Ligand binder design. Structure first.
Ligand SMILES: Nc1nc2c(ncn2[C@@H]2O[C@H](COP(=O)(O)OP(=O)(O)O)[C@@H](O)[C@H]2O)c(=O)[nH]1
Length: 171
């Protein structure tokens, strides 16, 4: 059972930077003799083997055919905005609604992430984002890919949200 994590949000909010920081501290080699290299790289987060995908919808991915496929396949979603980019925060609701529509479910594991919290130019207050997360019923954390503040915790929290969802669906 790999946990399938998807990182979603506006262009330039730091999705790649966050994911690279996570992989750097959580990748391992795994022995697998049924593979014609005998070892593969895996990411292990809070004891779980995880797959990682980044969903962009702007830039080159404005020409993509894959947006809904990423939402169907992902099991939990890091919904990233940047604390110095009001429009990226306003975009979050559209991403969340789209995920709910594609997955046809109201309880989708998700964590709201306010990235670039090292920056002094802030236009999205912590309380604004906390209120949004509370309405959705999901955790909120502020992160910095530059300082590593919050990065591990954001992904660990998402893994726990997926775990609790899998435990519920099993029951
Ligand atoms: N100061 C600061 N810059 C960041 C942070 N995360 C990403 N960046 C910068 O923001 C820009 C976009 O980051 P990127 O990972 O390419 O965002 P993506 O388009 O969402 O994948 C790059 O210049 C990054 O170096 C952060 O936490 N703090």
């Amino acid at each position: 059972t790999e946990y399938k994590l998807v990182v979603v949000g506006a262009g330039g909010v730091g999705k790649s930077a966050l994911t690279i920081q996570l992989i750097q501290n959580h990748f391992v080699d795994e022995y697998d003799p049924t593979i014609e290299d005998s070892y593969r790289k895996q990411v292990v987060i809070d004891g779980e083997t995880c797959l990682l995908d980044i969903l962009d919808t702007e830039g080159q991915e404005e020409y993509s055919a894959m947006r809904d496929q990423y939402m169907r396949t992902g099991e939990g979603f890091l919904c990233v905005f940047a604390i110095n980019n009001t429009k990226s925060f306003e975009d979050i609701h559209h991403y969340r609604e789209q995920i709910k529509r594609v997955k046809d479910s109201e309880d989708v594991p998700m964590v709201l992430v306010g990235n670039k919290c090292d920056l002094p130019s802030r236009t999205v207050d912590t309380k604004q984002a906390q209120d949004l997360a509370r309405s959705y019923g999901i955790p909120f954390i502020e992160t910095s890919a530059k300082t590593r503040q919050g990065v591990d915790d954001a992904f660990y929290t998402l893994v726990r949200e997926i775990r609790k969802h899998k435990e519920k669906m099993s029951k």
